[PDB]
């Protein structure tokens, strides 16, 4: 329910391969955030008007 | 070491295992430490706990020769992962890693347990080409043929030596009666929950490899005389038939409609193919006969 | 709370029949119909007509 299929591919890219930068399997809920900050977040989060 | 550790300190060291391996760009202490809890997880006495920490171990490899002999220090534990309870066959280099240490040395008894471990383990291992081929690939040792037991079991690699099982029990129970290198015996039959289990899987060996070797004269063989020529009882042979036949790695055909049935090959249900091979190839051999008959008879007639 | 008691575990054990029939007949083609069904523990109760149907 948070507006942050094509991105999910890069989502897992970022999150998983940074856990592999961390070099472990277990994927965290923070890994979502790691995949939700390097994205199309230009102008967060409402045209305000 | 406060209490020499416990499940609490096991959880401690484990939680401190997989966190720092990358905050600590470490090649040796990380190796000598990811093993440090191998006891705290084997003193835990849980096969799958050791296997989880080994799933951790897989991360670190090319461990060979960290120092000149750091692996002669770690491989004891690496094989200790599945040393006395592990799979009888996945010990290929596991139950091999024991030979090199006193092969690096010039030991006599420690090298003898090294040898009679690098060999007396595959008889536990199920049948395979690897075991069979390798145990004679590794043949050529000089310290190994100095053991009547090694010679005895190495001879077993042909005709199965369908021997009175108690005779082999002598040959490999007097290992514990060695006024010489005996650590072979303790590695083999100084053990109880696996050494006696080694005797059991040795019964498995004799019966199943005899099934292998005796596959020639079959298509006529009785359940009773099976046991008679098996060095084991009939209902013992019943259970052996049962396990080898539900394993069914070979295709026999048996029934107690008579009990005279055998660990057979497909029992020859085939058409002319048999006749075809026979007639054709035999007749061909006969034309070959003729064609060299002329030749060699002429040769022996050369002087005349 | 079983919706139907005519099919649920009925079909399970139905499948299991031949699933247990490929363990007593898995070893060899020919066999005594008794000890082959000593595993199913009934040598002639229902093994007979079941395997016939099969």
Coordinates of C-alpha atoms in Angstrom, one line a residue:
Chain A
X1 CA 0.0 0.0 0.0
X2 CA 3.0 2.4 -0.2
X3 CA 3.5 4.1 -3.6
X4 CA 7.2 3.8 -4.0
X5 CA 6.5 -5.4 -11.7
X6 CA 9.4 -4.0 -13.6
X7 CA 10.8 -2.2 -10.5
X8 CA 10.4 -5.5 -8.4
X9 CA 13.2 -6.9 -10.7
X10 CA 15.5 -4.0 -9.7
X11 CA 14.0 -4.1 -6.2
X12 CA 15.4 -7.6 -5.7
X13 CA 18.5 -6.6 -7.6
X14 CA 19.4 -3.8 -5.1
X15 CA 18.1 -5.6 -1.9
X16 CA 19.4 -9.1 -2.6
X17 CA 22.7 -8.2 -4.2
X18 CA 23.4 -5.8 -1.3
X19 CA 22.7 -8.6 1.1
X20 CA 25.3 -10.3 -1.0
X21 CA 27.3 -7.2 -0.5
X22 CA 26.5 -8.2 3.1
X23 CA 27.2 -11.7 1.7
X24 CA 24.4 -13.6 3.4
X25 CA 21.1 -15.3 2.4
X26 CA 18.5 -14.0 4.9
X27 CA 16.6 -11.1 3.3
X28 CA 15.2 -8.5 5.6
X29 CA 12.3 -6.1 5.6
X30 CA 14.9 -3.3 5.6
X31 CA 16.1 -4.8 2.3
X32 CA 12.8 -3.5 0.9
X33 CA 13.9 0.0 2.0
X34 CA 17.3 -0.5 0.4
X35 CA 15.4 -1.1 -2.8
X36 CA 13.0 1.9 -2.1
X37 CA 15.6 4.7 -1.9
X38 CA 17.7 4.2 -5.1
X39 CA 14.5 4.5 -7.2
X40 CA 12.2 7.0 -9.0
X41 CA 11.7 8.9 -5.7
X42 CA 12.3 12.3 -7.5
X43 CA 10.0 14.8 -5.6
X44 CA 8.6 13.0 -2.5
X45 CA 5.9 12.5 -2.1
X46 CA 2.9 14.7 -3.3
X47 CA 2.6 17.6 -5.8
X48 CA 1.1 19.2 -2.7
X49 CA -1.5 21.1 -4.6
Chain B
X1 CA 35.5 -20.5 29.1
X2 CA 33.6 -19.0 32.1
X3 CA 31.8 -22.3 32.2
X4 CA 33.7 -23.7 29.2
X5 CA 30.6 -22.7 27.4
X6 CA 27.2 -24.2 26.9
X7 CA 24.2 -23.8 24.5
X8 CA 24.2 -20.1 25.5
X9 CA 27.8 -19.6 24.5
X10 CA 27.2 -21.8 21.5
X11 CA 24.5 -19.3 20.4
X12 CA 27.0 -16.6 21.3
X13 CA 29.8 -17.7 19.1
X14 CA 27.4 -18.7 16.3
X15 CA 25.8 -15.2 16.3
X16 CA 29.4 -13.9 16.2
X17 CA 30.3 -16.2 13.3
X18 CA 28.5 -14.8 10.2
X19 CA 28.4 -11.1 11.1
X20 CA 32.1 -10.1 10.9
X21 CA 33.5 -12.2 8.0
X22 CA 33.1 -9.1 5.9
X23 CA 33.7 -6.5 8.6
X24 CA 36.8 -8.7 9.1
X25 CA 38.5 -9.3 5.7
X26 CA 40.0 -12.4 7.3
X27 CA 41.7 -15.4 5.6
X28 CA 43.0 -17.5 8.5
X29 CA 41.5 -16.5 11.9
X30 CA 38.1 -16.4 10.2
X31 CA 38.8 -20.0 9.0
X32 CA 40.2 -21.0 12.4
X33 CA 37.2 -19.4 14.0
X34 CA 34.3 -20.5 11.8
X35 CA 35.6 -23.9 13.0
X36 CA 36.0 -22.8 16.6
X37 CA 32.3 -23.5 17.2
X38 CA 32.5 -26.8 15.4
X39 CA 32.6 -28.3 18.9
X40 CA 30.1 -25.9 20.4
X41 CA 27.8 -27.2 17.6
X42 CA 29.0 -30.8 17.9
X43 CA 29.2 -30.8 21.6
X44 CA 25.6 -29.6 21.0
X45 CA 25.3 -33.1 19.6
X46 CA 23.0 -32.4 16.7
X47 CA 23.9 -33.7 13.2
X48 CA 21.9 -30.9 11.5
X49 CA 23.4 -28.3 13.8
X50 CA 26.9 -29.2 12.6
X51 CA 25.5 -29.4 9.0
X52 CA 24.1 -25.9 9.4
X53 CA 27.4 -24.6 10.6
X54 CA 28.9 -26.5 7.6
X55 CA 26.5 -24.8 5.2
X56 CA 28.2 -21.8 6.8
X57 CA 31.6 -23.4 6.3
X58 CA 31.0 -23.7 2.5
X59 CA 31.3 -19.9 2.3
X60 CA 35.0 -20.2 3.2
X61 CA 37.0 -22.6 0.9
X62 CA 40.3 -22.9 -0.9
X63 CA 41.3 -23.4 2.7
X64 CA 44.1 -25.8 1.6
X65 CA 47.4 -24.6 3.1
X66 CA 46.5 -21.5 4.9
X67 CA 49.7 -21.9 6.8
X68 CA 52.1 -24.7 5.7
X69 CA 49.8 -27.1 7.6
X70 CA 46.8 -25.1 8.8
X71 CA 44.7 -27.5 6.9
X72 CA 46.4 -30.4 8.7
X73 CA 44.9 -28.7 11.7
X74 CA 41.4 -27.9 10.3
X75 CA 40.7 -31.0 8.1
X76 CA 40.5 -33.0 11.3
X77 CA 37.4 -30.9 12.1
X78 CA 36.3 -30.7 8.5
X79 CA 36.1 -34.5 8.4
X80 CA 34.9 -34.4 12.0
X81 CA 31.7 -32.9 10.5
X82 CA 30.9 -36.5 9.3
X83 CA 33.7 -38.5 10.9
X84 CA 32.1 -41.3 13.0
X85 CA 28.4 -40.9 12.2
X86 CA 28.5 -39.4 8.6
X87 CA 27.5 -41.1 5.4
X88 CA 29.6 -44.2 4.6
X89 CA 30.5 -42.9 1.1
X90 CA 30.5 -39.0 1.1
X91 CA 33.8 -39.4 3.0
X92 CA 35.7 -39.6 -0.3
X93 CA 38.3 -36.9 0.6
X94 CA 36.9 -36.7 4.1
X95 CA 38.1 -40.2 5.0
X96 CA 41.1 -39.5 2.8
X97 CA 42.3 -36.3 4.6
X98 CA 43.6 -38.6 7.3
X99 CA 46.3 -40.2 5.2
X100 CA 48.2 -37.0 4.2
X101 CA 49.1 -35.9 7.7
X102 CA 51.4 -38.8 8.5
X103 CA 52.2 -39.1 4.8
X104 CA 53.6 -35.6 5.3
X105 CA 55.2 -37.2 8.3
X106 CA 57.0 -40.5 8.2
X107 CA 54.8 -42.0 10.9
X108 CA 54.3 -45.7 11.6
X109 CA 51.1 -46.2 13.7
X110 CA 49.5 -42.8 13.2
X111 CA 50.3 -43.3 9.5
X112 CA 48.8 -46.8 9.9
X113 CA 45.5 -45.5 11.2
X114 CA 45.8 -42.9 8.4
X115 CA 46.1 -45.8 5.9
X116 CA 43.6 -48.2 7.4
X117 CA 41.2 -45.2 7.5
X118 CA 41.9 -44.1 3.9
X119 CA 41.0 -47.7 2.9
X120 CA 38.9 -49.4 5.6
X121 CA 36.2 -46.8 5.1
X122 CA 35.1 -47.5 1.6
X123 CA 34.0 -51.0 2.6
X124 CA 31.5 -49.1 4.6
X125 CA 30.8 -47.0 1.4
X126 CA 28.1 -48.5 -0.8
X127 CA 29.2 -50.2 -4.1
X128 CA 30.4 -47.8 -6.8
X129 CA 33.0 -47.6 -9.5
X130 CA 34.7 -44.7 -7.6
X131 CA 35.3 -46.8 -4.5
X132 CA 36.3 -49.8 -6.6
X133 CA 38.5 -47.9 -9.0
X134 CA 40.1 -45.6 -6.5
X135 CA 41.0 -48.2 -3.9
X136 CA 43.3 -49.7 -6.5
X137 CA 44.3 -46.3 -7.9
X138 CA 45.5 -45.5 -4.5
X139 CA 47.1 -49.0 -4.5
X140 CA 50.9 -48.8 -4.7
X141 CA 51.5 -47.8 -1.1
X142 CA 54.5 -49.4 0.7
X143 CA 53.3 -49.1 4.3
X144 CA 49.9 -50.5 3.5
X145 CA 50.7 -54.0 2.3
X146 CA 52.5 -54.4 5.7
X147 CA 49.0 -55.1 7.2
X148 CA 47.5 -58.6 6.8
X149 CA 44.1 -56.9 7.2
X150 CA 44.7 -54.5 4.3
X151 CA 45.8 -57.3 2.1
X152 CA 42.8 -59.4 3.2
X153 CA 40.2 -56.7 2.4
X154 CA 42.1 -55.7 -0.8
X155 CA 41.8 -59.2 -2.1
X156 CA 38.0 -58.9 -1.4
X157 CA 37.9 -56.7 -4.5
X158 CA 37.6 -59.8 -6.7
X159 CA 35.2 -62.9 -6.5
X160 CA 34.0 -61.1 -3.3
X161 CA 35.9 -63.7 -1.3
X162 CA 32.6 -65.4 -0.2
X163 CA 34.4 -66.2 3.0
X164 CA 33.1 -67.6 6.3
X165 CA 32.1 -64.3 7.9
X166 CA 33.6 -65.3 11.3
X167 CA 37.0 -65.8 9.6
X168 CA 37.0 -62.2 8.5
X169 CA 35.7 -61.3 12.0
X170 CA 39.0 -62.9 13.2
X171 CA 41.1 -61.1 10.6
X172 CA 39.5 -57.7 11.7
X173 CA 39.0 -58.4 15.4
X174 CA 42.6 -59.2 16.0
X175 CA 43.3 -55.6 14.8
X176 CA 42.1 -54.7 18.3
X177 CA 44.7 -57.3 19.3
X178 CA 47.6 -55.5 17.7
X179 CA 50.9 -55.3 19.7
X180 CA 51.7 -52.7 17.0
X181 CA 49.8 -50.0 15.2
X182 CA 46.3 -50.5 16.5
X183 CA 44.8 -47.0 16.0
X184 CA 43.5 -48.6 12.7
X185 CA 41.4 -50.9 14.8
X186 CA 40.0 -48.2 17.0
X187 CA 39.2 -46.1 14.0
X188 CA 37.4 -49.2 12.6
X189 CA 36.3 -51.6 15.3
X190 CA 37.3 -49.9 18.5
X191 CA 33.9 -48.2 17.9
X192 CA 30.5 -49.4 19.1
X193 CA 27.6 -47.4 17.7
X194 CA 29.4 -47.3 14.4
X195 CA 32.2 -49.8 14.6
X196 CA 29.7 -52.6 15.4
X197 CA 27.5 -50.8 12.8
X198 CA 30.6 -51.2 10.6
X199 CA 30.4 -55.0 11.2
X200 CA 26.7 -54.8 10.3
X201 CA 27.3 -52.9 7.0
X202 CA 30.1 -55.4 6.5
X203 CA 27.5 -58.1 6.5
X204 CA 25.7 -55.9 4.0
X205 CA 28.9 -55.8 2.0
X206 CA 29.4 -59.6 1.9
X207 CA 25.8 -60.4 1.0
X208 CA 25.3 -57.7 -1.7
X209 CA 28.7 -58.1 -3.3
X210 CA 28.2 -61.8 -3.3
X211 CA 24.9 -61.2 -5.1
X212 CA 27.1 -59.2 -7.5
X213 CA 29.8 -61.8 -8.1
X214 CA 27.6 -64.9 -8.3
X215 CA 25.5 -63.6 -11.2
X216 CA 26.8 -66.2 -13.6
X217 CA 25.4 -69.7 -12.8
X218 CA 22.0 -68.3 -11.9
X219 CA 18.4 -69.0 -13.3
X220 CA 18.4 -72.0 -11.0
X221 CA 19.0 -71.4 -7.3
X222 CA 17.1 -72.2 -4.1
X223 CA 16.2 -69.9 -1.2
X224 CA 17.7 -72.5 1.2
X225 CA 20.9 -73.3 -0.8
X226 CA 21.1 -69.5 -1.3
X227 CA 21.8 -69.1 2.4
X228 CA 23.9 -72.2 2.2
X229 CA 26.2 -70.5 -0.3
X230 CA 25.8 -67.1 1.4
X231 CA 27.6 -67.5 4.7
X232 CA 24.4 -66.3 6.3
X233 CA 21.0 -67.7 7.4
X234 CA 18.0 -68.3 5.2
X235 CA 15.7 -65.7 6.9
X236 CA 18.8 -63.7 7.1
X237 CA 18.9 -64.3 3.4
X238 CA 15.2 -63.5 3.4
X239 CA 15.8 -60.0 4.7
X240 CA 18.8 -59.7 2.4
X241 CA 16.7 -60.6 -0.6
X242 CA 14.1 -58.2 0.7
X243 CA 16.4 -55.2 1.0
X244 CA 18.4 -55.9 -2.2
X245 CA 15.1 -56.6 -4.1
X246 CA 13.2 -53.5 -3.0
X247 CA 16.4 -51.6 -3.7
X248 CA 16.2 -53.5 -7.0
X249 CA 19.2 -51.8 -8.5
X250 CA 19.4 -55.1 -10.4
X251 CA 16.4 -56.8 -12.0
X252 CA 15.9 -60.3 -10.7
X253 CA 12.7 -62.4 -10.6
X254 CA 11.8 -64.5 -7.6
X255 CA 8.7 -66.1 -6.0
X256 CA 8.1 -68.5 -3.1
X257 CA 5.9 -70.6 -5.4
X258 CA 9.0 -72.7 -5.3
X259 CA 11.7 -70.7 -3.5
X260 CA 14.1 -71.9 -6.2
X261 CA 14.6 -68.5 -7.8
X262 CA 17.6 -66.3 -8.2
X263 CA 19.2 -62.8 -8.2
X264 CA 18.8 -63.0 -12.0
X265 CA 19.3 -60.9 -15.1
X266 CA 16.2 -60.3 -17.2
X267 CA 15.8 -64.1 -17.4
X268 CA 16.2 -64.2 -21.2
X269 CA 12.7 -63.3 -22.5
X270 CA 14.1 -62.3 -25.8
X271 CA 13.4 -63.3 -29.4
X272 CA 15.7 -64.3 -32.2
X273 CA 18.1 -61.5 -31.1
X274 CA 19.8 -64.2 -29.0
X275 CA 19.8 -66.6 -32.0
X276 CA 20.8 -63.7 -34.3
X277 CA 23.9 -62.8 -32.3
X278 CA 24.8 -66.4 -31.9
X279 CA 24.4 -67.6 -35.5
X280 CA 25.8 -64.5 -37.2
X281 CA 28.8 -63.8 -35.0
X282 CA 29.7 -67.5 -34.6
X283 CA 29.5 -68.1 -38.4
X284 CA 31.6 -65.0 -38.8
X285 CA 34.2 -66.4 -36.4
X286 CA 34.1 -69.5 -38.6
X287 CA 34.9 -67.6 -41.8
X288 CA 37.7 -66.0 -39.8
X289 CA 38.8 -69.5 -38.9
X290 CA 39.0 -70.4 -42.6
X291 CA 40.7 -67.2 -43.6
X292 CA 43.5 -67.7 -41.1
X293 CA 43.5 -71.5 -41.6
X294 CA 44.8 -71.1 -45.1
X295 CA 47.4 -68.6 -43.8
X296 CA 48.8 -70.4 -40.8
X297 CA 48.7 -73.9 -42.5
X298 CA 50.7 -72.4 -45.4
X299 CA 53.1 -70.9 -42.9
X300 CA 53.7 -74.2 -41.1
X301 CA 54.0 -75.6 -44.7
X302 CA 56.6 -73.0 -45.7
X303 CA 59.7 -75.1 -45.1
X304 CA 58.0 -77.8 -47.2
Chain C
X1 CA -15.9 -30.0 9.2
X2 CA -15.3 -32.4 6.3
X3 CA -17.5 -31.2 3.4
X4 CA -17.8 -34.7 1.8
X5 CA -17.0 -37.9 3.6
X6 CA -17.5 -40.0 0.4
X7 CA -14.3 -38.9 -1.4
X8 CA -11.8 -37.0 0.8
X9 CA -9.6 -39.7 2.4
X10 CA -11.3 -42.4 0.4
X11 CA -9.4 -41.3 -2.7
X12 CA -6.3 -40.9 -0.7
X13 CA -6.3 -44.5 0.5
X14 CA -7.5 -45.6 -3.0
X15 CA -4.3 -44.2 -4.5
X16 CA -2.4 -45.5 -1.5
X17 CA -3.6 -49.0 -2.4
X18 CA -1.6 -49.1 -5.6
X19 CA 1.0 -46.9 -3.9
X20 CA 1.4 -49.9 -1.5
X21 CA 0.9 -52.3 -4.5
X22 CA 4.1 -50.8 -6.0
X23 CA 6.1 -51.9 -2.9
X24 CA 5.0 -55.5 -2.6
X25 CA 5.1 -56.0 -6.4
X26 CA 8.0 -53.5 -6.8
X27 CA 10.6 -56.2 -5.8
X28 CA 9.6 -58.9 -8.4
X29 CA 6.9 -59.9 -10.9
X30 CA 5.8 -63.2 -9.3
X31 CA 5.0 -63.5 -5.6
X32 CA 2.8 -65.3 -3.1
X33 CA -0.4 -63.4 -2.8
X34 CA -0.2 -63.9 1.0
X35 CA 3.1 -62.4 2.1
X36 CA 2.9 -59.8 -0.7
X37 CA -0.2 -58.8 1.2
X38 CA 1.2 -59.4 4.7
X39 CA 2.6 -56.0 4.1
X40 CA -0.9 -54.7 3.5
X41 CA -1.6 -57.1 6.4
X42 CA -4.7 -58.6 4.6
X43 CA -3.6 -61.5 2.4
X44 CA -7.1 -62.1 0.8
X45 CA -9.5 -59.6 2.4
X46 CA -9.7 -56.9 -0.3
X47 CA -6.3 -57.1 -2.0
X48 CA -7.8 -59.8 -4.3
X49 CA -10.6 -57.8 -5.9
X50 CA -8.7 -54.6 -5.7
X51 CA -5.7 -55.9 -7.6
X52 CA -8.1 -57.7 -10.0
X53 CA -9.8 -54.4 -10.8
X54 CA -6.3 -52.9 -11.3

